Design a protein around this ligand. Structure first.
Ligand SMILES: [Zn+2]
Ligand SMILES: [Zn+2]
Lengths: 260, 222
């Protein structure tokens, strides 16, 4: 069932992660107690470890987590199958920079050639309906399922395809595989919800309502899917230490309200 | 028309706050664009609930007193020995004591015949004529020494806090205790919905920044 990953590059990327892990920081996450969202834009959340309150950049933690799952579960991923189909050519229209057909076609060309590799090693299924030389008809069948009960936001999907052809280096094994995992985690991390002025009368009710729903969806995802997983399998790397800040030592606050 | 700008800033701060969630079953972590003097604040849940409760208790008492609907339970065979000057002090402020349901008559060495007491005080004194004497003297001396102004009922919404200072210490203490006992405690479970209601209600209080016993209700951590 589980395939034997004998690639020297994947073992080398795994070794780099294993060396990078900080013991005392992983201890904080392993025994965390999630409080709630602090900032949906700066992607901040609050947790309690022992009797200290911490401010955590969940975007950074989710990036390290979805890169970690991709590394350990390499070439053994599930599938997220998608009337309401997604076209690769029409997806890149959100970029004014691509002022040519040959520029939009060059991204798809590199990806479709490596479709056999992308479908096998990552579960990124790419299916074409038209001619082998034609690129406008190339679509995306399924994406890897790293976490059960978690479907990523497709807002970052045109950016994922743009960075899949223009960023990912297809000329070196390790750098190609390291780049793809980095591109998946970047897509998989929960989206940023930029602050919308509710008190302002100039903005419509529907704009205000969707911003509230975006906030609701992120809090729910963190409480039920993201943070339980983080507390179970996340291994904190030394570099993430700047994104874990102590905001309060609760014993000090007990003195303030000791005698009512 | 000129007004002191510093009074308005303090009120608008808590009104622009969103609840994160309960912390350690002891606090409510809250979060605040346009940050002059307002980010993360830890609110003591007990102090928060007690504050809402006290202002509700003060509003009730004063609306009852102002409208002349403050209940006064009839007291039987209650007479206390008083000084010549003490009998004079009570004779003078008899009308003022009647505003709180403390109805009495001065006889004559002298004596004090208490006819009525509000249920709040009937319960507290509990037959102790010495406690009742100390407490009525306490208010009589507060009125005399200008430590407490009299109740101005010459006025026909009601702002209880514009009559707050007039409340006798004995009633103040009683309501503080009622608020404290009825309030949520440390170790108690609060849902986010329960926390939202508490902070929403606290922001509608005249003084949200302290408990009944004058200690702070919240601490900023950012
Ligand atoms: Zn108190
Ligand atoms: Zn209390």
């Amino acid at each position: 069932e589980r395939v034997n990953v004998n690639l020297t590059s994947i073992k080398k990327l795994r070794e780099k992660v294993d060396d990078s892990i900080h013991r005392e920081l992983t201890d904080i996450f392993a025994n965390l107690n999630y409080v709630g969202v602090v900032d949906e834009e700066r992607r901040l959340a609050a947790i309690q470890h022992d009797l200290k309150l911490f401010l955590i950049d969940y975007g950074s933690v989710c990036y390290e987590l979805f890169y970690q799952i991709g590394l350990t579960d390499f070439a053994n991923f599930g599938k997220i199958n998608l009337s309401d189909d997604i076209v690769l050519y029409n997806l890149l229209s959100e970029f004014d920079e691509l002022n040519d057909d040959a520029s939009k076609e060059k991204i798809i060309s590199k990806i479709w050639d490596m479709s056999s590799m992308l479908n096998e090693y990552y579960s990124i299924e790419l299916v074409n309906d038209g001619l082998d030389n034609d690129l406008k008809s190339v679509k995306l069948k399924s994406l890897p399922l790293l976490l059960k009960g978690y479907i990523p936001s497709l807002v970052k999907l045109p950016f994922f395809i743009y960075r899949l052809g223009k960023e990912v280096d297809w000329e070196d094994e390790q750098e190609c595989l390291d780049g793809i995992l980095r591109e998946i985690a970047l897509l998989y991390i929960p989206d940023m919800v930029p602050k919308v002025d509710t008190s302002d009368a100039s903005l419509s009710e529907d704009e205000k309502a969707q911003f509230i729903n975006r906030k609701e969806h992120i809090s729910s995802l963190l409480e039920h899917v993201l943070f339980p997983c983080i507390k179970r399998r996340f291994l904190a790397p030394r570099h993430i230490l700047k994104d874990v800040v102590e905001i309060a030592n609760l014993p000090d606050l007990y003195k303030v309200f000791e005698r009512c | 028309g000129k007004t002191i700008t510093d009074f308005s800033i303090s009120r608008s701060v808590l009104a622009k706050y969103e609840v994160i969630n309960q912390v350690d079953k002891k606090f409510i972590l809250i979060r605040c664009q346009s940050i002059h003097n307002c980010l993360l604040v830890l609110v003591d849940q007990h102090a928060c609930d007690e504050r809402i409760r006290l202002e509700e208790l003060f509003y009730s008492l004063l609306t009852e007193v102002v409208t002349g609907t403050f209940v006064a339970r009839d007291l039987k065979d209650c007479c206390i020995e008083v000084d010549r000057t003490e009998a004079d002090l009570f004779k003078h402020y008899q009308s003022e004591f009647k505003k709180w349901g403390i109805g009495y008559e001065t006889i004559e060495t002298s004596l004090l015949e208490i006819k009525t007491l509000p249920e709040m005080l009937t319960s507290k004194y509990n037959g102790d004529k010495d406690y009742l004497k100390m407490v009525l003297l306490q208010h009589a001396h507060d009125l005399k020494d200008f430590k407490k102004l009299p109740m101005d009922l010459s006025h026909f919404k009601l702002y209880w806090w514009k009559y707050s200072s007039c409340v006798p210490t004995v009633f103040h203490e009683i309501l503080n205790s009622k608020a404290c006992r009825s309030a949520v405690m440390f170790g108690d479970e609060l849902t986010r919905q329960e926390c939202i209601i508490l902070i929403s209600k606290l922001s509608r209080c005249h003084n949200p920044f302290e408990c009944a016993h004058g200690r702070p209700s919240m601490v900023p951590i950012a």
